[PDB]
Write a protein that binds this ligand. Structure first.
Ligand SMILES: *[C@@H]1O[C@H](CO)[C@@H](O[C@@H]2O[C@H](CO)[C@@H](O[C@@H]3O[C@H](CO)[C@@H](O)[C@H](O[C@@H]4O[C@H](CO)[C@@H](O)[C@H](O)[C@@H]4O)[C@@H]3O)[C@H](O)[C@H]2NC(C)=O)[C@H](O)[C@H]1NC(C)=O
Length: 266
């Protein structure tokens, strides 16, 4: 209570423990805390089990806290949001068995180089997954099979060279897909299925414009109003779409949706 800032009234009880050189969870915290901020601390190691006493905790922010090892012990039955962004995790924590009600997971800007087969098992309620700014080169097929309710997916600014065929199949609620600034060369045929994807970011990739890019070319033409350019700190309020941002070899004068495709089968 005295160490961190507390704010109550209606909605819930938010506890702010940011920037306090904390190396562990303060033993002095309101048992009814619903939102806990532990950002900007020195949590090289942290154990989720230490939060079990706080039964109403629905949001936990452990971002920018030098997090290196996250111990996933017991169970936090009502935790809905977990922010682990801007930390030093080299492996994705396996959270399914501990955070069954999780809807938002942010592990952006960590040190991930790959994702395991078990990755998202058990996170059936997941709605937002952010993995921007890591160094992923490829994704396991079936990565998103445990998360059919996904609405937002961010794989921006990684090192992806290709996407698994079928990655989006089954995601009938997907509204935002961020894939900008990777090393993507093509899009698997039928990748987007028959689902309407309102916000897609595909710029900053060295698209290879050959006959294999024709599926993507047609999709871009049919979805020109759903393609956008990312702008830090700004909501896609009504931001003007810009299909021309998706370019062959990331060359400004050669947008993929204008690629002629000379010498290519129908
Ligand atoms: C994941 O993706 C990251 C983003 O592309 C990537 O980071 C880039 O890495 C390259 C290679 O290390 C960086 O390029 C070098 O930059 C330094 C300083 O800016 C230059 O001195 C250096 O000189 C050139 O090196 C060439 C060989 O690579 C050589 O042929 C040239 O003659 C010349 O000597 C490079 O230009 C680049 O800046 C990084 N980008 C950023 C924004 O950090 C990661 O390496 C990649 N991760 C993995 C695992 O591949």
């Amino acid at each position: 209570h005295p160490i961190c800032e507390v704010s109550k009234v209606a909605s819930h009880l938010e506890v702010n423990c940011d920037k306090r050189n904390l190396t562990a969870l303060p033993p002095d915290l309101p048992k009814d805390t619903t939102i806990l901020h532990l950002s900007e601390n020195l949590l090289y190691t942290f154990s989720l089990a230490t939060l079990m006493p706080y039964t109403r905790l629905t949001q936990l922010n452990l971002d920018r806290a030098e997090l290196t090892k996250l111990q996933v012990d017991g169970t936090l039955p009502v935790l809905g949001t977990l922010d682990l962004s801007h930390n030093q995790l080299q492996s994705l924590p396996l959270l399914g068995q501990t955070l069954p009600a999780l809807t938002v997971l942010d592990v952006s800007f960590n040190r991930l180089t790959s994702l395991p087969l078990g990755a998202l098992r058990g996170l059936g309620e997941l709605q937002e997954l952010y993995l921007k700014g890591n160094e992923l080169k490829t994704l396991p097929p079936g990565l998103l099979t445990p998360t059919p309710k996904l609405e937002k997916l961010s794989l921006a600014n990684n090192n992806l060279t290709e996407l698994p065929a079928g990655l989006l199949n089954g995601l009938e609620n997907l509204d935002t897909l961020l894939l900008q600034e990777n090393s993507l060369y093509t899009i698997p045929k039928g990748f987007f299925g028959s689902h309407l994807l309102p916000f897609a970011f595909l710029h900053g990739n060295p698209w290879l414009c050959n006959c294999e890019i024709l599926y993507f070319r047609r999709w871009l033409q049919d979805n020109a109003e759903n393609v956008y350019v990312w702008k830090q700190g700004v909501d896609v309020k009504a931001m003007t779409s810009n299909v021309a941002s998706v370019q062959c070899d990331n060359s400004d004068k050669f947008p993929v949706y204008k690629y002629p495709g000379k010498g290519c089968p129908t």
